[PDB]
């Protein structure tokens, strides 16, 4: 687990939610 979001600390499974997490940091969603 090499990547973590710097602004957010909350934790969850990296399958679905992480896709959205990274995506909403690129596109405001
Ligand atoms: Zn984040």
Curated annotation (Swiss-Prot):
Complex and partners: Homooligomerizes (via the BTB/POZ domain), multimerization is required for DNA binding. Interacts (via the C-terminal zinc fingers) with GIF1; the interaction results in the recruitment of MYB to the CDKN1A/p21 and CDKN1B promoters and repression of transcription. Interacts with TRAF2, interfering with the binding of UBC13 to TRAF2, and inhibiting TRAF2 E3 ligase activity. Interacts with MYC (via the C-terminal helix-loop-helix motif); the interaction inhibits ZBTB17 transactivation and growth arrest activities and renders it insoluble in the nucleus.
Gene from which the chain derives: ZBTB17
The species this protein was found in: Homo sapiens (Human)
Superkingdom of this protein's organism: Eukaryota
Boundaries of the shown chain within the full protein: 444 to 472 of 803
Protein name: Zinc finger and BTB domain-containing protein 17
UniProt similarity note: Belongs to the krueppel C2H2-type zinc-finger protein family.
Tissue: Expressed in germinal center B-cells.
Summary of the function given for this chain in its UniProt record: Transcription factor that can function as an activator or repressor depending on its binding partners, and by targeting negative regulators of cell cycle progression. Plays a critical role in early lymphocyte development, where it is essential to prevent apoptosis in lymphoid precursors, allowing them to survive in response to IL7 and undergo proper lineage commitment. Has been shown to bind to the promoters of adenovirus major late protein and cyclin D1 and activate transcription. Required for early embryonic development during gastrulation.
Localization in the cell: Nucleus
Zn finger intervals (C2H2-type): 3-25
């Amino acid at each position: 687990k090499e990547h973590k979001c710097p602004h957010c600390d909350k934790k969850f499974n990296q399958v679905g939610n992480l896709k959205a997490h990274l995506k909403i940091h690129i596109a405001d969603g």
